[PDB]
């Protein structure tokens, strides 16, 4: 838990934070206001890929960054 980004709202860090994976499955016109390339907060590389732009990683330099926003 506490990877980097968040599911929909901020502050929290999703319920399942086993592996941090930058999954971007826009599928079709995405859903809500999207996210910062869904940095992660899910399971490990289970197959993913194919269309969905994801970069799975078990932390260790996945989130260590200055900030999310950037005026």
């Amino acid at each position: 838990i506490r990877c980097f980004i968040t599911p929909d709202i901020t502050s929290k860090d999703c319920p399942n934070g086993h592996v941090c994976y930058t999954k971007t499955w826009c599928d079709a016109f995405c859903s809500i206001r999207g996210k910062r390339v869904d940095l992660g907060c899910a399971a490990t590389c289970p197959t993913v890929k194919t269309g969905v732009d994801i970069q799975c990683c078990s932390t260790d330099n996945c989130n260590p960054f200055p900030t999310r926003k950037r005026p």
Binding site: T6, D8, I9, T10, S11, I32, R33, K35, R36, T67, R68, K69
Partner: peptide, 18 residues
């Protein structure tokens, strides 16, 4: 209707909608 509603998301504040 002014500073009542606000869409957070991404990073800044808590719960977005209601």
């Amino acid at each position: 209707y002014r500073g009542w509603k606000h869409w957070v998301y991404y990073t800044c504040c808590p719960d977005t909608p209601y």
